[PDB]
Amino acid sequence: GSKPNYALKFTLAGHTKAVSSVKFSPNGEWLASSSADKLIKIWGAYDGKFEKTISGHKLGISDVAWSSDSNLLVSASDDKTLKIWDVSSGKCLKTLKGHSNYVFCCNFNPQSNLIVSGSFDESVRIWDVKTGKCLKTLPAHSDPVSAVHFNRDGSLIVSSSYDGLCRIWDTASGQCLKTLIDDDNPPVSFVKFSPNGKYILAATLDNTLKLWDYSKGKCLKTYTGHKNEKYCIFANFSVTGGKWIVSGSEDNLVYIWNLQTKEIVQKLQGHTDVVISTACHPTENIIASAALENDKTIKLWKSDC
Numbered sequence: 001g002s003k004p005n006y007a008l009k010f011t012l013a014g015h016t017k018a019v020s021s022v023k024f025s026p027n028g029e030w031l032a033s034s035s036a037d038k039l040i041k042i043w044g045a046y047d048g049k050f051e052k053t054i055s056g057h058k059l060g061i062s063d064v065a066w067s068s069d070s071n072l073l074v075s076a077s078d079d080k081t082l083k084i085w086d087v088s089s090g091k092c093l094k095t096l097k098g099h100s101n102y103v104f105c106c107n108f109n110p111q112s113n114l115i116v117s118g119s120f121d122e123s124v125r126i127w128d129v130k131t132g133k134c135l136k137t138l139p140a141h142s143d144p145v146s147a148v149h150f151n152r153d154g155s156l157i158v159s160s161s162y163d164g165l166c167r168i169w170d171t172a173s174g175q176c177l178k179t180l181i182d183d184d185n186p187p188v189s190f191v192k193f194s195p196n197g198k199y200i201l202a203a204t205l206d207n208t209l210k211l212w213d214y215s216k217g218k219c220l221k222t223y224t225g226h227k228n229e230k231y232c233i234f235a236n237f238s239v240t241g242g243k244w245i246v247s248g249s250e251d252n253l254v255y256i257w258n259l260q261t262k263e264i265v266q267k268l269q270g271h272t273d274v275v276i277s278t279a280c281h282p283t284e285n286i287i288a289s290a291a292l293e294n295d296k297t298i299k300l301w302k303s304d305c
């Protein structure tokens with residue numbers, strides 16, 4: 001139908017501190033979760049079945065991301081490192097050292113030969129997956145980096161910061177192409193490219209999501225109704241059914257908007273703390289949501305539409 005009907009199917013318990021991120025594997029089989037408890041957990045995407053715990057970070061994890069082939073994860077930790085993991089063995093393949101403060105956000109490029117990271121040290125780093133060597137350090141921002149993401153062909157990186165800026169970087173040179181958002185405030189708490197790489201979805205700590213045209217550098221859509229003044233809450237393009245924007249909220253709800261009309265089409269109730277992270281399954285109408293330390297659970301929601 002025209003609106004989704006997401007309903008709770010599974011609650012995934014096991015993290016012992018706040019969950020920080022959840023991500024579906026590109027092949028759809030797995031959900032990965034990261035937590036302040038220093039652990040990564042792997043779960044079945046369709047039945048929530050616990051698969052394994054991946055351990056090694058010395059302090060909490062703020063983000064985890066999948067390689068394009070679903071075989072590797074990268075994690076960003078308060079221990080100032082990223083780790084690359086073999087999902088099948090659970091083994092740490094590489095430790096990426098160079099940031100001078102907490103690593104907050106990470107992602108592979110589509111090629112999955114590079115990792116991008118953002119840190120409280122105000123830099124963005126670009127890493128070689130094969131060697132674990134730092135290829136480039138970008139003096140990207142003047143406050144902690146809240147998000148980093150590659151576009152569809154890997155030629156661009158978008159970054160956001162508490163400095164109030166969203167910047168787009170040429171991957172190959174590390175040089176800045178555009179400052180898309182240039183305000184002193186509010187903090188930009190999240191950014192990512194649209195699936196086709198033409199738009200950027202940006203969260204600001206004034207309870208606002210905006211969809212930007214990258215080429216024109218202009219705001220096309222605004223999404224409001226949720227609460228977001230403190231946390232770096234992820235947002236998603238839902239594309240398997242109806243075309244939605246999905247975000248967590250500091251009122252403990254998942255918000256779903258119609259991307260074109262900007263109307264709220266569903267609010268998912270169940271969590272008992274801030275919904276910090278949401279993920280949309282690559283082929284099924286399935287949302288994963290995760291909450292902070294009063295809750296510490298992940299929820300799987302399914303819709304017919």
Ligand SMILES: C=CC(=O)NCCCCc1nc(CO)c[nH]1
Nearest residue numbers: 020062063104105146147231232
């Ligand atoms: C204020 C800090 C805060 O939001 N802490 C919660 C755990 C980390 C969530 C998280 N958000 C992103 C967006 O790139 C990465 N990791």
